[PDB]
From a paper:
In order to identify intracellular metalloproteins, we performed yeast two-hybrid screening of the human proteome using CCSdI as bait and found that an uncharacterized protein encoded as open reading frame 123 in chromosome 1 (C1orf123) interacted specifically with CCSdI. The crystal structure revealed that C1orf123 binds a Zn2+ ion in a tetrahedral coordination with four Cys residues from two CxxC motifs. Instead, the overall folding pattern of C1orf123 and MAL13P1.257 is unique in that it is not observed in any other proteins registered in the protein data bank. C1orf123 is thus expected to perform some tissue-specific functions, but as of now, no definitive conclusions can be drawn on the function of C1orf123.
The phase was successfully determined due to the anomalous signal from a zinc ion in C1orf123, allowing us to solve the crystal structure at a resolution of 2.0 Å. In our crystal structure, C1orf123 appears to sandwich the Zn2+ ion with two loops, each of which contains a CxxC motif. More precisely, the Zn2+ ion is ligated in tetrahedral coordination by four sulfur atoms in Cys33, Cys36, Cys67, and Cys70, with typical Zn2+-S bond lengths ranging from 2.15 to 2.39 Å. In addition, a bond angle (∠S-Zn2+-S) ranges from 100o to 117o, indicating the symmetrical tetrahedral coordination of a Zn2+ ion. Regarding the Zn2+ binding in C1orf123, it should be also noted that C1orf123 was crystallized as a Zn2+-bound form in the crystallization solution at low pH (pH 4.5). The most notable difference is that C1orf123 but not MAL13P1.257 binds a Zn2+ ion. The loop with Cys33 and Cys36 in C1orf123 (colored magenta) is located at similar position to that of MAL13P1.257 (colored light green), but the other loop with Cys67 and Cys70 in C1orf123 moves toward the Zn2+ ion so as to wrap it around. C1orf123 is like a rugby ball in its shape and has characteristic charge distribution on its surface; the zinc-containing side of the protein is positively charged, while the other side concentrates negative charges. We also found the positively charged pocket adjacent to the bound Zn2+ ion.
Numbering used by the authors: 2 to 160
Amino acid sequence: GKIALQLKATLENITNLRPVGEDFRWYLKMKCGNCGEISDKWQYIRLMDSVALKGGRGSASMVQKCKLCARENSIEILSSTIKPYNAEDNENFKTIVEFECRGLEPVDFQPQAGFAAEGVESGTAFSDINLQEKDWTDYDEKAQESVGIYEVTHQFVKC
Ligand SMILES: [Zn+2]
């Protein structure tokens, strides 16, 4: 099964907002599809981490044994599905990544740092944006204007 993570935010003079880097941390809460167990802990997964699965199943970002029912579950970030959140997406949900899930679905998301974006006309780069507080403000010197990302929210959808 594939699950899409959709972001929404209110944008100020900003576009091309996206996760960057192999070490980018997707902080998630995950639910075992066998027994309904949801760990209390935020757990992060990264592209950088990559474990072989058995059969011709390829790879996963994380494999774990559910603590309640003991099933081996896995999740894989699909690198090719990572998409930017752009000025035209303002205030709409948009899929920014997809996960290949084998027995374990993400049910919550805590964005933190490692995002990047760009001034919409200036093209000035804003690197390592931390969205943990769901609101972010900076100033674009070239464009002589404020930039911001506000009211960040998310949802998961089947895909
Ligand atoms: Zn379980």
